[PDB]
Amino acid sequence: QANLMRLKSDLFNRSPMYPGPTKDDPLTVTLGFTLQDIVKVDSSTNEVDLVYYEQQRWKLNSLMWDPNEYGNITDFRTSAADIWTPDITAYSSTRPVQVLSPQIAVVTHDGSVMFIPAQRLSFMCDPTGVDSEEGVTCAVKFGSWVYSGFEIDLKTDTDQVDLSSYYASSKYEILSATQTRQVQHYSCCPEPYIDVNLVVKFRER
Amino acid sequence: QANLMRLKSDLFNRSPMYPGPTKDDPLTVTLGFTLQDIVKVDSSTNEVDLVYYEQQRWKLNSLMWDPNEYGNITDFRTSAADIWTPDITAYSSTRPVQVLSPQIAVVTHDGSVMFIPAQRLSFMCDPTGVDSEEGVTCAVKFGSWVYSGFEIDLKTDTDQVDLSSYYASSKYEILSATQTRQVQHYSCCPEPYIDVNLVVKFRERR
Amino acid sequence: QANLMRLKSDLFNRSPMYPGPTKDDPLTVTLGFTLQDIVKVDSSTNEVDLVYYEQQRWKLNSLMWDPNEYGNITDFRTSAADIWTPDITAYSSTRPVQVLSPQIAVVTHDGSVMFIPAQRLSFMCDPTGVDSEEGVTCAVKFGSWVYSGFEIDLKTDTDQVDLSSYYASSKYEILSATQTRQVQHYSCCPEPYIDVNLVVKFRERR
Amino acid sequence: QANLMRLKSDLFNRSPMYPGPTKDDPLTVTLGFTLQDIVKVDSSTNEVDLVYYEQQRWKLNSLMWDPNEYGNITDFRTSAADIWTPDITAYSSTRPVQVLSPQIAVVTHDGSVMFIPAQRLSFMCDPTGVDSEEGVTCAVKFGSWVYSGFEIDLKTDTDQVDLSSYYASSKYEILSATQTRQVQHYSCCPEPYIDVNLVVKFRER
Amino acid sequence: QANLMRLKSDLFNRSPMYPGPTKDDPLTVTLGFTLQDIVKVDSSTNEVDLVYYEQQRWKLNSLMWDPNEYGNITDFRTSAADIWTPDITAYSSTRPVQVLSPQIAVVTHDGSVMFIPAQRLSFMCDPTGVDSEEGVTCAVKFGSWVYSGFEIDLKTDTDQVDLSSYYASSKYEILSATQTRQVQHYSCCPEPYIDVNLVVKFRER
Ligand SMILES: c1ccc(C2CCN(CCc3cc4ccccc4[nH]3)CC2)cc1
Q1: How much distance in Å is there from the Cα of C2 to the middle of ligand 1?
Q2: How close, in Å, is residue A5 to chain B by CA atoms?
Q3: Is E5 within 8 Å of A22 when comparing Cβ atoms?
Q4: Yes or no, beta carbons of B1 and C19 under 8 Å apart
Q5: Rounded to whole angstroms, what are the CA distances from C164 to A167, B130, C117, C139, C174?
Q6: E143, E154 in Cβ contact below 8 A?
Q7: I need a labelling partner for E102 at 20 to 30 A (CA). Which of B130, D78, D132, E114 fits?
Q8: What is the DSSP string of D115-134?
Q9: How far apart, in whole angstroms, are the C-alpha atoms of residue B41 and residue B50?
């Protein structure tokens, strides 16, 4: 207990928080989606509600330590407020995202961080043809709101969304769910922007 | 009031907060559910709303004291923000949980903590057959979001949910309610994962 | 303004906040309800919404002062966040209570505190028979969530709920509204538990 | 910018916040309503929703300064959290009031404060007869929750609610809107209770 | 990293926050709208819900630095709470605006600030004729709530709202969307007030 208290004090109370990446020191953020349920479909407003959990991973040199100096502690859990977290947001949401899980991250001695928020998201989708055999395709882009591809490099481990935790008695059946890295340009900035496109094909069970 | 002010100052202002359990220092958390009401059933979205209070108890050596050194004070009440609390959550919720009670915990001189938040939860459940004699079975898993079974040992005193405070004029009658501890070794890694599966069998009152 | 600034500084900046009552130093809290309106009745979920004022009164020796030492100031108003407040909650609510008034309390030189939050509460009630001449009876208990009768002694001035401020053009007419103090004993602990049962008999106007 | 930074520091960092009025030092608060729209009417719950802005004015000696000592600055804007604000509330609301504007106040060198929060309020009103030619009359009292007329003297500039900003394509048309000050006296206590009774007569367009 | 941590410390911890503009030191705020979707239309309450990005740009001398003194850092990202932000609000909203993006701003070495909050707004609009070929015209004014045209000079880059990110499968089709600067005079003091009128002509798809 004493060694962990000493580690947290040395990492967070001694030095200031990580101020975010720069062009000279970019950061790689790996995203992964686990789709739990398509809760609601609104044909009158063209909104679809998803329940999912987003796995986020990044590495910081400022969060590194030698386990031998801290009673062989290799990892710990801390409030997400105690550390820097990437500004990953849905680009086509219609309501503020609702958090369904505790905001706690796991820090490893090599500086690796894992943050897995469970969320409910309302996003822009026309559900016409959901009642058919062919179904309907919905798509939402996830990315850093303010950091370009020069500061935050977004990645996926696989393009396959995890559907092993998908609610078996859901109103909607998943036909396909993919997560793809895209490099986009905007009438904003000449720098490239990176997003992860979550594409879900579904129909009424 | 002076002895309690002195105790709170010695326990919270002198030392930093408990940083959570580790594999070398695991923590046992006892979980208990008291079901008060099945408020809403949504057949179009497959959501069911429960009102219940979740009893949580754990013991910390850092929260121990000698009552004789603090005017024979054996226990006290403090804001849940002043102490560490386990990250126990519903794994299949559809809305952020709503708190219906003050966020205050009871600390005993032996280091025991009791925190009983009253909550309204919307979770995933197909209520088809609720209008029948047989009823319908809903299930929701509770556990630590970030800690494994090597850090947090989640347990239940009984597998029976307390139904003594269940609303008598509820729209739904409950037929059975169990709280069972489950160990899931199947995930990735050699570490086990623990959860309390709250299983409720219910039907429309008649 | 200078004398009040000096008083608030001496009462709040000099000493830490009151840490709550103990068995050795209990606190009496007087509770009173002023029913303003029965806003909503939900026959499909068995929820009833009330708008009421909850008068709360307690006395603290730490909040006492001599008016002669502070320019003859006998009382003042302060944010409820600057002082300790009792954890009085509804035992059968279905939604987090909504606050409709500023969270400010009145402190008197004898240490008396007056806190009257205006609230909207959704609680468990079957409103079947509200459309009848006889009406329907709803009940909701109020009490400390974590303190027993040995730490917080809950009291009422009267058995009657103040209906003088009840909305005259409400959808529902009040036939009777009582607030009764109840002492309960549970098998698990020897301490008595106190609650105020708010019982309201009402029907659809005319 | 330097003179304003110096003024704010001298007014807020040097001295503690105004502790509120007393019987010996009473404060006059001038209240004014600008009705923007009657959004919703609920015949099943007897609730009416208004969108309006509430002009509040008071004067404090602690907020006075000599413009000549601060680069001829006669007034400034500050967050409402930096200053004391009166506890003016609706006495018959059914939902917590929703704030539609930034919580910023204007302070003048003579100690005058102007705070104009834009709000959405749900209050108790039977709207039976709104669909008729005669319309319906709704009333809602506003006043200090904890201060009596001996501490806060509530006033109005006019009896007329400002309707110059009322939404022209509203579902409901305003037939009359008064803003009248009332004194309530009791036999028990010598303390008067002051309120501003906002009375609105309206019908469906 | 070290140079950025040093820059943020020198800009925010050394000096107090920007206290806002004055008549003697006015500020130009550039406003731009990117309409993403007309989510909801409520014919019973006369409310229309929009999802848009509000680009805000201003320049402060207090936020200037020499990149050469800070490891050639030309820009950075910081929480909107760490800096002053203009009180730009919708004048005819019916609900508190909902934020759909992280509250982070970009600061450039010349003192330029870019803040782009993504929002969901419910505002006053009669949607009668939306089901027709001609459609319906909705308008909503945006401006500083407490600052006059003598303190905050509101500007636009173009008269045209960015519709390149408008949801293609929306329930409503955009016929025209303009953002125009207006100098209006209110019932208060003789100082002019500036706004940006967002006018949207739309119909059912
Ligand atoms: C402490 C002191 C005052 C108040 C308010 C005073 C103004 N009243 C509207 C009219 C009113 C009723 C009423 C009932 C008891 C005593 C004084 C009262 N004044 C609303 C309550 C609240 C808390």
Answers
A1: 27
A2: 6
A3: no
A4: yes
A5: 52, 44, 17, 20, 11
A6: yes
A7: D78
A8: E--EEEEEEE---TTTTSSS
A9: 9
CA E109 to chain centre: 22
Helix/strand/coil for B101: coil
Single out the residue of E24, C98, A51, E52 nearest to residue B91, CA to CA.
A51
Minimal C-alpha gap between B21 and chain A (Å): 8
User: Does residue E98 belong to the interface with chain D, where contact is any CB pair within 8 Å?
Assistant: no
Q: Are D112 and D135 in contact (CB under 8 A)?
A: no
B residues 30-89 closer than 8 Å to A (CB) = 44-47, 61-62, 87, 89
Q: For residues E131 and E148, what is the distance between their CA atoms, to the nearest angstrom?
A: 39
| Cα B101 from Cα B98, distance rounded (Å) | 9
Cβ pair C53, C117 in contact under 8 A: yes
Contacts of B101 in chain C (CB under 8 A): 89, 145
Whether the CB of E145 is below 8 Å from some CB of chain D: the reply is yes
Q: Which pair of structure tokens corresponds to residue B44?
A: 């179009």
From residue E192, how far is each of A45, A94, D56, E147 by CA, in Å?
A: 39, 35, 21, 10
The torsion angles phi and psi of B90, rounded to 5 degrees, stand at -80, 130
Reported as half-sphere exposure (CB side, CA atoms, 13 A), residue B8 has a value of: 17
Task: Find, among C165, C134, C130, C137, the residue nearest to C55 by Cα.
Answer: C165
Q: Is D186 in the pocket of ligand 1 (CB under 6 A)?
A: no
- Asked whether C116 and C56 are in contact (CB, 8 A), the reply is yes
Tell me the residue type at B140. V
**CA–CA separation, E149 and E59 (whole Å):** 17
The verdict on a CB contact (< 8 Å) between B167 and C124 is yes
Q: Which of D8, D33, D53, D100 to mutate to test the interface with E (most CBs of E within 10 A)?
A: D100
Contacts 24+ apart (CB under 8 A), B20-24: B20/A4, B20/A76, B20/A77, B20/B84, B20/B147, B20/B151, B21/B147, B21/B151, B21/B152, B22/A1, B22/A4, B22/A73, B22/A76, B22/B151, B23/B150, B23/B151, B24/A71, B24/A72, B24/A73
Neighbours of C164 (CB within 10 A): 6
Amino acid at E74: T
How far apart are the C-alpha atoms of E25 and E30, rounded to whole Å?
Answer: 17
* Tokens linked to E85: 């932000």
Per the CB < 8 A criterion, the answer to whether C7 and C67 are in contact is no
**Contact D147/C36, CB-based, under 8 Å?**
no
Write out chain C residues lying below 8 Å of D25, CB-based.
Answer: 1
A25 is in an annotated binding site: no
Contact by Cβ (8 Å): C43, C127: yes
Q: Are D62 and C1 a contacting pair at CB < 8 A?
A: yes
At E69, give phi and psi (nearest 5°): -85, -5
What token pair was written down for D124? 């108790």
Q: Is the CB of C104 under 6 A from ligand 1?
A: no
CATH number of the domain that residue A34 is part of = 2.70.170.10
Q: What are the E-state strand segments in chain A?
A: 27-42, 47-64, 75-79, 88-90, 98-99, 104-108, 110-115, 118-124, 136-144, 152-156, 172-186, 189-204
Q: This structure's resolution (angstroms)?
A: 2.5
- The phi and psi torsions of A8 (rounded to 5 degrees) equal -60, -40
Half-sphere exposure for A46 (CA within 13 Å, toward CB): 26
Domain count, chain D: 1
Assess whether the C-beta atom of D145 lies below 6 angstroms from ligand 1: yes
Count of C-beta atoms within a 10 Å radius of residue C77: 21
Structural domain that includes position A49 = 1-205
Residue A116 burial (CB count, 10 A): 17
Report which of C201, C106, D79, B25 is spatially closest to residue A76, judged by C-alpha positions: B25
CB C2 within 8 A of CB D18: no
